[PDB]
Structures are given as structure tokens and as C-alpha cells.
Amino acid sequence: SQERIKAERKRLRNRIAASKCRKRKLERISRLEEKVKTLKSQNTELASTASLLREQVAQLKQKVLSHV
Amino acid sequence: EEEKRRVRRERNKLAAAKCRNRRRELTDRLQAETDQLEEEKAELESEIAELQKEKERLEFVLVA
Ligand SMILES: *CC(=O)c1ccc(OC)c2c1OCC2=O
Ligand SMILES: [Cl-]
Ligand SMILES: [Cl-]
Ligand SMILES: [Cl-]
Numbered sequence A: 001s002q003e004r005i006k007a008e009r010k011r012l013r014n015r016i017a018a019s020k021c022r023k024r025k026l027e028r029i030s031r032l033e034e035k036v037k038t039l040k041s042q043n044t045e046l047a048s049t050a051s052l053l054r055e056q057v058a059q060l061k062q063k064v065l066s067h068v
Numbered sequence B: 001e002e003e004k005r006r007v008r009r010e011r012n013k014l015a016a017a018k019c020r021n022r023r024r025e026l027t028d029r030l031q032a033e034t035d036q037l038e039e040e041k042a043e044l045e046s047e048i049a050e051l052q053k054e055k056e057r058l059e060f061v062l063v064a
Helices: A002-066 B003-062
Strands: none
Touching: A002 B003
16 A cells, blocks of 8 residues: 555665665775784784894994904 | 654664764774874884984995
8 A cells, every 4th residue: 555655665765775884884894904904914024124123233233343 | 642653763863873883982993903003003114214224334334
């Protein structure tokens, strides 16, 4: 009946709108969490190289200190 | 009565507010984590820079 169809139009309109918003939110959370994982990697390696350079320079300083 | 309808309206409004603020707790947790990982990444980037500066200098100090 036109009244019933009315009720159903509004039900399956609000519901499909919710189904749009749900996806737009979850893809967002996903991106953010992938970027957190990506930075926590690009930091493990950056600190590897940083502390490696630290050891190398504390060695080269000693070479110079030995030849004077 | 239809004031049950106004009550369901103004109730489920403020209840959807629940997951909106939960999503905000989660997304802003992530956003602050990320900001700070960026501050730290930047520190390391410039520290690598300065370290390599002084390393190449010491190397051209040994030979020269
Ligand atoms: C937060 C909210 O109103 C909402 C809307 C639609 C959903 O179904 C996919 C769900 C929520 O919160 C939890 C959830 O499953
Ligand atoms: Cl509505
Ligand atoms: Cl927001
Ligand atoms: Cl914010």
C-alpha cells in the first residue's frame, strides 16, 4: 500500500545511507592504521642506521686521537 | 501517542552519538600516534644528517 511503500522507502533509504557512511569510516581508520605501521617501520630502520653511524664515528674519532 | 516517536527520535540521535565518539576516540588515538611518530622520524632524519656530516669530516681528517 502507498503508506507501507512509504515506510519502506524511508527504511531502506536511511539504511543504505548508513551503509555508505560505514565504509567511508572504516577505510579511514584503515588508512590511519596502515600509516602507523609504516612509520613504525621507517623508524626501526632509521634508528638502525642512526646508531650504526654513531658507532662508526666514535671509532673514527679514536683513530684520529691515536695518530696525534 | 506520537510523543513516543519524538522520544525515539531524540533517543537514538544521542545514541548514534555513541559510536561517533567511539570512532573519534579511535581515529584520534591513531592521529596522535602518527603525529608523534612523525616528530620522531624527523628527529632521526636530521640526526642521521648531522652524524654523516661529522663522519665524512673525520674521514677527510684522517687522510688530510
Ligand atoms: C554507530 C552507528 O550508529 C552504527 C551504524 C550502523 C552500523 O551497522 C553496520 C553500526 C553502527 O555502530 C556499530 C555498527 O555495527
Ligand atoms: Cl531519518
Ligand atoms: Cl571529525
Ligand atoms: Cl582532531
